[PDB]
A paper describes a structure:
pmcAmyotrophic lateral sclerosis/parkinsonism-dementia complex ([name]/[name] or lytico-bodig) is a fatal disease found in the Chamorro population of Guam (1–4), some families on the Kii peninsula of Japan, and the Auyu and Jakai people of New Guinea. Abundant filamentous amyloid inclusions that are made of all six brain tau isoforms are characteristic of [name]/[name]. We now show that tau filaments from Guam and Kii [name]/[name] adopt the [name] fold in brain and spinal cord. The greater heterogeneity of amyloid filaments, when compared to [name] and SSPE, probably reflects the fact that [name]/[name] is a multiple proteinopathy based on neuropathology, as suggested for cases from the Kii peninsula.
We analyzed extracts from temporal cortex of eight cases of [name]/[name] from the Kii peninsula. Cases 4 and 5 also contained tau-paired helical filaments (PHFs), like those from AD and other conditions. We used the standard tau filament extraction method for all eight cases, and the optimised procedure also for cases 6 to 8. Besides tau filaments with the [name] fold, we also observed tau PHFs in three cases from the Kii peninsula and tau filaments with the CBD fold in one case. Besides AD, the Alzheimer tau fold also characterizes primary age-related tauopathy, familial British dementia, familial Danish dementia, and some prion protein amyloidoses.
Author numbering:
A (entry chain F), B (entry chain E), C (entry chain A), D (entry chain B), E (entry chain D), F (entry chain C), ...: 304 to 380
Write the structure that this text describes.
Amino acid sequence: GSVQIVYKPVDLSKVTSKCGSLGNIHHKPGGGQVEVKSEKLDFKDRVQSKIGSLDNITHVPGGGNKKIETHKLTFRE
Amino acid sequence: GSVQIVYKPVDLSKVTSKCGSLGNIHHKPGGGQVEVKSEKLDFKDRVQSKIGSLDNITHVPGGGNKKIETHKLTFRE
Amino acid sequence: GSVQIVYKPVDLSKVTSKCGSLGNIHHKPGGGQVEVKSEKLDFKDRVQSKIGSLDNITHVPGGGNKKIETHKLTFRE
Amino acid sequence: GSVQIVYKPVDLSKVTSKCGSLGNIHHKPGGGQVEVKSEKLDFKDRVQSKIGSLDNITHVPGGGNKKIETHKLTFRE
Amino acid sequence: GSVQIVYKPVDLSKVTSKCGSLGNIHHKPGGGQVEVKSEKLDFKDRVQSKIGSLDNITHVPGGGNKKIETHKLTFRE
Amino acid sequence: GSVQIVYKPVDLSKVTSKCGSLGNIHHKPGGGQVEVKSEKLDFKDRVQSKIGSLDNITHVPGGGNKKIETHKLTFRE
Amino acid sequence: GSVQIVYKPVDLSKVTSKCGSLGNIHHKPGGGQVEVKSEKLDFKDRVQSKIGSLDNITHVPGGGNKKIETHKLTFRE
């Protein structure tokens, strides 16, 4: 009683982006006020806590393109 | 009772980005005020805590492109 | 009862970025005020804590492109 | 009952970035004020704590490109 | 035809201020951004021009009290 | 036709200020950004021009009190 | 036709300030950024021009008190 498994994922994908020009991009924030009053914090296992923040990203890629691919062959006899 | 497994992922992907020019990108923040009053913090295991922050990224790649790929063959007899 | 396993990941990927020019990129922050009052901190195991910060990245790569790939064949008889 | 395992990852990847010119990149921060009042800190095991910081990176690579690859064959009889 | 003029201003004024204590006075500004683009300026005769300014007075007198008094006898025959 | 003029300003004024204590006075500015682009400036006669300034006075007198008094007898026959 | 003029300003003024103590006065500025681009400047006659300045006075007198007094008898026959 043979088990024969044949995983053959072929992937000829493409992800592609032509641009002429990005040009004028002003990002001109006027100041903030933030206040946070915590007493106790217990974080445990897997955490990300951005607590009490005032911030400004200006993320201008020259085409940001992204491809994700997850293959998984679990087997249990 | 033979177990024959054949994992053959072929991947001819591409991720691609032409640009002419990025040009003018002003990022001109006006100042902040942040206040954070914590008493106790216990972090444990796996943490990232950006607590009480005032900050300014200007991330301008010449095309940022990204490809992720995770293969996994677990087997349990 | 033979176990025959054959992991053959072929990967002909590419990640690619042409640019003409990046040019003018002003990042001109006006000053901050940050205040943080913690009493106790116990970090343990795996931590990253940026506490009480005021900061300014200007990360301008000439195309930042990135490829991740994780293969894993666990086997338990 | 023979166990035959054959891990043959072939990887013909490429990560690539042409640029003409990066050119004008001003990073002109105006000063900060930061205050941090901690009493006790106990860090343990694996930590990174940037506490109470005011800072300015200007990271301008000539194309920063990065490839990660982790292979792992655990086996337990 | 005699002209007899008799100016007799008597002034027994007082201006007065008792205080116990002034005590805690925090003046904690978070930073600014100002931009001014003038081409031509011609000022003439009597001017005060504070142009393009970012500033912070903290004027804490121990009682500031002020008395003005202007007398004037013009005469034209 | 005699002209008899008698200017007799008597002035018994007082300006006065008792204080116990001035005590805590924090003046803690977070940094600025100022930009001024003028082409031509012609000032003439009587001018004061504070152009393009970023500044911080902390003027704490021990009672600042001030008295002004201007007398003037013009006469034209 | 005699002109008889008698200017008799009597002035028994006082300006006065008792204080116990001035005590804690922190003046803790965080740095600035100033930019000024002028082409031509012609000042003439009576000028004061503080152009392009970043500065910090901490003027703490032990009571600053001030009295001004201007007398003037012009006469034209």
